[PDB]
Amino acid sequence: NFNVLFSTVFPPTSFGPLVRKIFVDGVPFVVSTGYHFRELGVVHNQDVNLHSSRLSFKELLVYAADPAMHAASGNLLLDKRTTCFSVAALTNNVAFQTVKPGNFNKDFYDFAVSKGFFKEGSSVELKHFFFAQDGNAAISDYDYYRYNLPTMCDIRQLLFVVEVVDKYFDCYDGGCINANQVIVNNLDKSAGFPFNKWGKARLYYDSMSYEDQDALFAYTKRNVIPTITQMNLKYAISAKNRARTVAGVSICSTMTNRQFHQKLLKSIAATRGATVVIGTSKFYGGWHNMLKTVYSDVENPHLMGWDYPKCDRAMPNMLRIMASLVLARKHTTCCSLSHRFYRLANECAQVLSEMVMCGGSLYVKPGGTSSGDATTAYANSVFNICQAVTANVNALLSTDGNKIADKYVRNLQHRLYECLYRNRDVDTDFVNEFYAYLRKHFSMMILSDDAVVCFNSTYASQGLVASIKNFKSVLYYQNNVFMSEAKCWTETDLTKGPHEFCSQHTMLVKQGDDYVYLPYPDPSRILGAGCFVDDIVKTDGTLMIERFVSLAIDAYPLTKHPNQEYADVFHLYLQYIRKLHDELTGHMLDMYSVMLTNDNTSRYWEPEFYEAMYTPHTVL
Amino acid sequence: FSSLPSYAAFATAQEAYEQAVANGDSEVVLKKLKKSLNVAKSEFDRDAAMQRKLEKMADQAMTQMYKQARSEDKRAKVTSAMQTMLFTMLRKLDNDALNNIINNARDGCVPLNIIPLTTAAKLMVVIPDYNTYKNTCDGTTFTYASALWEIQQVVDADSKIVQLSEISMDNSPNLAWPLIVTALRAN
Amino acid sequence: AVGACVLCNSQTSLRCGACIRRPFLCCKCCYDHVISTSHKLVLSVNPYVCNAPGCDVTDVTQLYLGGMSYYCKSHKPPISFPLCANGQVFGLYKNTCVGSDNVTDFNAIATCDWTNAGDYILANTCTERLKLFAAETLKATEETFKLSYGIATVREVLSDRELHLSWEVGKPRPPLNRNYVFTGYRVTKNSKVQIGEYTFEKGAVVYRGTTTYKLNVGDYFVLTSHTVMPLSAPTLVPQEHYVRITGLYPTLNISDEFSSNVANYQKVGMQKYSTLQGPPGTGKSHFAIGLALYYPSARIVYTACSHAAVDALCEKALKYLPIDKCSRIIPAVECFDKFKVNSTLEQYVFCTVNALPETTADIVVFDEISMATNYDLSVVNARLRAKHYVYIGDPAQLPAPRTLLTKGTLEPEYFNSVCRLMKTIGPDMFLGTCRRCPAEIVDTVSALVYDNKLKAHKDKSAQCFKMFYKGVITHDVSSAINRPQIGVVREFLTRNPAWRKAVFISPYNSQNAVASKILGLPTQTVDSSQGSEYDYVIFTQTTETAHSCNVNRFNVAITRAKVGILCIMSDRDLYDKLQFTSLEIP
RNA sequence: GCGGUAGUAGCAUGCUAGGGAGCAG
RNA sequence: UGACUGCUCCCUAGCAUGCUACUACCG
Ligand SMILES: [Zn+2]
Ligand SMILES: [Zn+2]
Ligand SMILES: [Zn+2]
Ligand SMILES: [Zn+2]
């Protein structure tokens, strides 16, 4: 916290990898042997050799990934399009990358129009499209990192919030795992800079034996390996005409982070009934269970949800270090105090203050999260609970203590000041008590910076529990954004569900003999997903009828809506799947004398294959 | 099945039973006509249900061993591509201007952000508009990073050569504007 | 782990172990060479051995398959499978199988422990690939026999030309002479530091090399055995007689350096390969210089095998040839640097087999083929493959340093493939014009093997002296001595003024070093001293056994001197087949 | 009259792998 | 050029279990 403030006095060219000249069989190389963090100060690698002869595989992967050799053999760069610090230009030309429009499925649009859709003055319009971009799109999206400003925190308050936050993560287990216990899905995805030139992640997961991976992982508990991140534009449907970019981190980072965090990140995704609902499904009654767990036993309940403006770009650098220290609290037997620092500096050097590749040039990231790191959705949920617990501390400590009529919420306000500003060590009897007070009067459900709260509505009006106005003050001094109270909602009647969670609306239907909660989408999102696609995909529906069975599953709970213009989106998808099947079994009978049997195909235009996805007693 | 070591018994028992059908067979020899190809047939089926398992097992190592070969051949093609890089990005270090800052260093460690800034030969400047151009790159020479650079080429976004006279105050609306100036170090 | 069966070349994946170098025996061919010999181990993409708990059962022939590992009988899972069966060891590519009836040689070559001449006779009657494999395994067994030596630990040094060296316990002193160049590598703390090219004299100690190192504490003297690379390209190619001269440009004028060279161009330019069969001192050093200048429009190269024999090719090069027009190569082993170094584009390239650049050519010369093993020809053909080449040398010289064969003598023909292929189909040429040499050698080599095809040129003035002294030989330790040699040399120079400015020949360097310690004479090599013979020389007895002087060792040693040749009899050597002068000893 | 044992064919469930596709943050 | 996770539908190949008829020996 002090280094954050003192590092704004020193030149910005002194922060980053510290390089030195080594010799590998009589030739001079420049390699990184340390780091200078604005927060953690100067760190020096522990195993550096100046005179070597032969480089192994595990010693070439650590020399190719380092930015020390790429940014010491390229041209100087002065980029006036952006205000971020710029390091080098790796080639002689600047790359300008654009985004193409979408493809039009004219058959589906004709079919929909011939069935009374898209009339003038209709409730359902088209609002989700494929937006095109010009060559000034990647740098204009990178330049949104000017919203990350140095932020000193209140340390006596944060050192208590971090202890109420590590109680939402007590029901899990975690630790380090060997290279033969690591689970990887879709090995056919990129592998970063210096490597996307030679293959995908499969090549590097096959070329490396288990012992090579173990040696690489144990190398980073004593050394620091900086890497390069590549910014990639996205090609997807949306409602805003702004570009979306993701960060593809390197393979030396992902490979070694998956052995550090994956045992805990898969026990979070396996717990049902907790605050973090990552892993739970919306199908087979899951959305009813999730909504009846958050409702718990609160009293006078109201529902609330808020927004995080510019969440990844504006998040401070001290609430991102605090999320890696809560996830690493599970490694308390497997790793030592010194092994858990070099696995923290290794995270900062790779996903917090790294060097990014935008075009053909290297820039310096000021701070903020990277979508592409392993623990993202899981580190975004630690930050979401930390900002909602400090809103409840600021709401109770700024309340006139003479007007509190209750006597339990008057000594709980008198011991919280002591625990914050008059104590120096952890008191594990008021933390367990504040954590129960919150769970009783302020119940949350969190999914990676999406949150829904059921709260006492006669305590938030008196001032003993956080409100929407208490989230607008915490985001102003702790997050450097202004949260307008027109992106947050509130709900008084609990028989209508949350207004929105995970882009889905809620509705109470009658199913069987009992009333349940069902999620339904935005009709313009499901309609606009059949009209606009990516060629050969759905510019011919017969070559993929599975796209429309997976889009009628999402459109099913629209049949229960009181609006009859919403309930027609499901019957339009069941009538098109039959059209695409009569054609297919009738196009292979007039050009090739083939006769297909319609047995076990009629289930996809009947409203009983889709009704079984929203009823308990799971199958498959 | 022509080499299973239990075909002889089966073959003989078939011949004894089947071929001797026309000949008058009493109710006592019929047992031999019946319980001789039986049991032998059971054993043969046992000798064929194990052969079928040995074959499949075998044809699961003559496929898992092509894959161990494939990968090692591949491991030797990437191990020789990173090597051919880290030795081509090295013959490019003007080792007179680089051994002059690693030497003035206290221990030989220097920040990496000052190596291209003080030991590079070429500069690339990317300029958005005309106003930025006259405050950064006016004339044929300009100073930046405590040095003096002399302009060598001005390409544009389309990558077509621009001249330093097309860049006016009023001809500016007629150029693809992200302009890229390439300059060389002086003295 | 997939390649050419040494024999069939089809793609295999196997490879024995017995075979130190580990060739890629095919599938089938393993069944022969695996059962038909102690050779049992086998390594394919994965190694074959009872993976069962710390076992130790191998001979695949017995090991069985199963599961996904292997198990002999050790603990063969219920679903086993013989690894070995129907003439084939289970291995990748099984239908491209073939094998070939060639385990014949293959088995003798594999089993040959290299102790008798029969090893070389059977090694030299096979096919091309078998020849390559045999040469490779011979060089392998010899270097791995030669590296069986310890280290020399040195901590202090008194002064120059003196050193107290002591070998390890149980390891004998490495051999005296310089045929094994002492390329040592000491240690400082972690790695190998350079020492320099060295050579020992005796157990005073004169350093006959050109270097100076700061030897002192912690010095470790070692013998460096280079890891030999596998040979790929063939050693030769069958020829074919053409009619059209392609590319070659005969000169408008006549470079009348020699007279008989016109027949050399007429006979050599036609066929795809030949050999300059020239008697000693009959133009075996500068005919290629004439071919270089008679064909200036043809790319011409020269390779050598020894650093010493660079005198004749250098003196006339400075006398009548330029400097820039030629080219030389030397890495940073050591040699003259007069000419241009690192020039891949030139017309007169001099190089040595240690290191050559990958390039093709059209005419090459290869000096001292008789010193060179088949591996040397194969490596100089693989590193530099050219259209035509001529092997300077003659089979009637000394054998190569094959210290592996002792009891049996080495006949010419079995020196290499060329030294017999040129005997069977006939020699391509024969010369008899000695530039600077009396006719004593002419008569000797005409009576011995030439059958008197070339006749005396210079008058036999009967100036050669031969006596009837035999001498006595005695062995005491690893180094040998000869008591009737310290006095015999003195007794022979008692009253002869002519040889007061003469040189000394050293068949055995130990006796020469001892005599130089007693009296003092310059040391001269016997093997790597062809073309460097001094005008006035003395031949010493120096030996009484069949180790070196049996038939083919004196033919080049009795022609060193030009005018005064004093060659005393040393053994039953041709004594009673001709006449000879004799100065009566006092 | 029945039970056990070893093959063979046929119908569903769960799990482990590969392939294509849909949605969410 | 194509990141990290989670859920879910459809198709093919292999493994074990669950009610049957067929074999055949054995009771
Ligand atoms: Zn750990
Ligand atoms: Zn072998
Ligand atoms: Zn065993
Ligand atoms: Zn073969």
A40 touches B at CB < 8 Å = no
Residues of B in contact with A32 (CB under 8 A): 112
Expressed in angstroms and rounded, the spacing between residue C42 Cα and the centre of ligand 3 is 16
**Chains with at least 3 CB pairs less than 8 angstroms from chain A:** B, C
End-to-end CA distance of chain A: 51
Query: CA-CA distance, C105 to C146, in Å (whole number)?
Result: 26
- Among candidates A541, A586, A567, A618, which has minimal Cα distance to A105? A541
Q: Nucleotides on strand D with an atom closer than 7 A to protein CB?
A: 6-8, 14-15, 19-25
Contacts of A425 (CB under 8 A, 6+ apart): none
- CA angle A374/A375/A377 to nearest 5° reads 115
Measured in whole angstroms, the distance separating CA B115 from the mean position of its chain's CA atoms is 31
A422 touches C at CB < 8 Å = no
- Among candidates A65, A66, A64, A91, which has minimal Cα distance to A77? A91
CA–CA distances in Å: residue A150 to residues A314, A376, C299: 10, 21, 72
CA–CA distances in Å: residue B126 to residues A79, A98, B170: 5, 18, 20
Query: CA-CA distance, B52 to B62, in Å (whole number)?
Result: 16
* Residue in B58, B60, B69 nearest the CB of C13: B69
Per DSSP, what are the bridge partners of residue A88?
A76, A362
Residue A347 three-state SS: helix
Instruction: Name every residue in C having a CB less than 8 A away from some CB of B.
Output: 1-2, 13, 44-46, 65-68, 79-81, 90, 92, 94
Residue C89 three-state SS: strand
Residues of A in contact with B144 (CB under 8 A): 78
CA distance A57 to chain C (A): 19
**Chains with at least 3 CB pairs less than 8 angstroms from chain C:** A, B
Residue A581 three-state SS: helix
Question: In the structure encoding, which two tokens stand for residue A32, read together?
Answer: 């990184």
Question: In the structure encoding, which two tokens stand for residue A311, read together?
Answer: 């969440």
Secondary structure letter of residue A559 according to DSSP: G
Per-position DSSP letters for C421-482, written without gaps between them: HHHHS--S------SS--SHHHHHHIIIII-S-S---S------B--------B--SSS-B-
Q: Please name the helix (run of DSSP H) or strand (run of DSSP E) that holds residue A137, with its range, or none.
A: helix A137-142
Per-position DSSP letters for B56-92, written without gaps between them: HHHTTTTTTTHHHHHHHHHHHHHTTTTTTTTTTSSS-
Which residues from the 524-543 window of protein chain A have CB within 7 angstroms of nucleic acid chain D?
525, 529, 533, 537-538
Q: What CATH code is assigned to C439-567?
A: 3.40.50.300
Query: CA-CA distance, C361 to C302, in Å (whole number)?
Result: 11
B165 touches C at CB < 8 Å = no
Secondary structure letter of residue C363 according to DSSP: E
For C186-225, give one letter per residue: b (16+ CB within 10 A) or e: beeeeeeeebbbbbbbeeeeeeeeeeeeebeeebbbbbee
A239 touches strand D (CB under 7 A): no
Q: Residue A550's CB: how many other CB atoms inside 10 A?
A: 9
CB contact under 8 Å between C66 and B68, yes or no, is no
Q: Say which residue the tokens 């000695």 belong to.
A: C434
Residue A206 three-state SS: helix
CB contact under 8 Å between B178 and A67, yes or no, is no
Query: CA-CA distance, C111 to C132, in Å (whole number)?
Result: 16
Question: In the structure encoding, which two tokens stand for residue A193, read together?
Answer: 């800079």
Helix, strand, coil percent values for chain B (each to nearest 5): 35, 15, 50
Please name the nucleotide lying closest to A282, CA to C1': E7
Query: CA-CA distance, C267 to C502, in Å (whole number)?
Result: 41
Query: CA-CA distance, A192 to A228, in Å (whole number)?
Result: 8
CA–CA distances in Å: residue A376 to residues A313, A390, C440, C446: 14, 21, 96, 94
Ligand-binding annotation for C19, yes or no, is yes
User: Where are the alpha helices (H) located in C99-247, listed in sequence order?
Assistant: 103-111, 117-123, 128-146
Ligand-binding annotation for C27, yes or no, is no
C38, C44 Cβ separation under 8 angstroms: no
Q: Please name the helix (run of DSSP H) or strand (run of DSSP E) that holds residue A247, with its range, or none.
A: strand A245-248
Query: CA-CA distance, A571 to A564, in Å (whole number)?
Result: 11
CA-based nearest residue in chain C for residue B60 = C68
CA-based nearest residue in chain A for residue B67 = A206
A431 touches strand E (CB under 7 A): no
Question: In the structure encoding, which two tokens stand for residue C173, read together?
Answer: 């002193």
Secondary structure letter of residue A540 according to DSSP: S
What is the β-pairing status of strands A505-511 and A514-520? antiparallel
User: Where are the alpha helices (H) located in chain B, listed in sequence order?
Assistant: 7-14, 29-34, 40-49, 51-58, 66-78, 115-118, 130-134
* Residues 332-351, chain A, touching B (beta carbon < 8 A): none
Q: Residue C87's CB: how many other CB atoms inside 10 A?
A: 14
A19, A32 Cβ separation under 8 angstroms: yes
Expressed in angstroms and rounded, the spacing between residue A177 Cα and the centre of ligand 1 is 8
CB contact under 8 Å between A67 and B113, yes or no, is no
Q: Residue A618's CB: how many other CB atoms inside 10 A?
A: 12
The one-letter code for the residue type at A173 is: D
- Catalytic site positions of A: 448-450
Q: Please name the helix (run of DSSP H) or strand (run of DSSP E) that holds residue A37, with its range, or none.
A: strand A28-37
Query: CA-CA distance, C499 to C535, in Å (whole number)?
Result: 10
Which residues from the 6-25 window of protein chain A have CB within 7 angstroms of nucleic acid chain D?
none
CA–CA distances in Å: residue C185 to residues B150, C198, C216, C223: 52, 11, 14, 8
B42 touches strand D (CB under 7 A): yes
C39, C66 Cβ separation under 8 angstroms: no
For C139-153, give one letter per residue: b (16+ CB within 10 A) or e: bebbeeeeeebbbbe
**Domain C260-425: CATH class, spelled out:** alpha beta
The one-letter code for the residue type at A275 is: T
Mutate to test the interface with B, among A79, A80, A187 (most CBs of B within 10 A): A80
CA-based nearest residue in chain B for residue C93 = B62
Expressed in angstroms and rounded, the spacing between residue C8 Cα and the centre of ligand 4 is 4
A554 touches strand D (CB under 7 A): yes
Measured in whole angstroms, the distance separating CA C549 from the mean position of its chain's CA atoms is 19
Ligand closest in space to the Cα of C70: 3
A247, A144 Cβ separation under 8 angstroms: no
Sheet of C384-391, strand order: C340-341, C326-328, C348-352, C300-304, C359-366, C384-391
Per DSSP, what are the bridge partners of residue A78?
B125
Query: CA-CA distance, A461 to A465, in Å (whole number)?
Result: 8
Q: Nucleotides on strand E with an atom closer than 7 A to protein CB?
A: 1-11, 23-26
CA distance B71 to chain C (A): 11
CB contact under 8 Å between B157 and A96, yes or no, is yes
Ligand closest in space to the Cα of A335: 1
- Nominal resolution (angstroms): 3.1
A21 touches C at CB < 8 Å = no
Which residues from the 496-525 window of protein chain A have CB within 7 angstroms of nucleic acid chain D?
502-503, 521, 525
For A411-428, give one letter per residue: b (16+ CB within 10 A) or e: ebbebbeebbeeeeeeee
Ligand-binding annotation for A334, yes or no, is yes
Please name the nucleotide lying closest to A254, CA to C1': E4
Q: Residue A620 burial by CB count (10 A; 0-12/13-18/19+): exposed, middle or buried?
A: exposed
Ligand-binding annotation for C314, yes or no, is no
The one-letter code for the residue type at A102 is: G
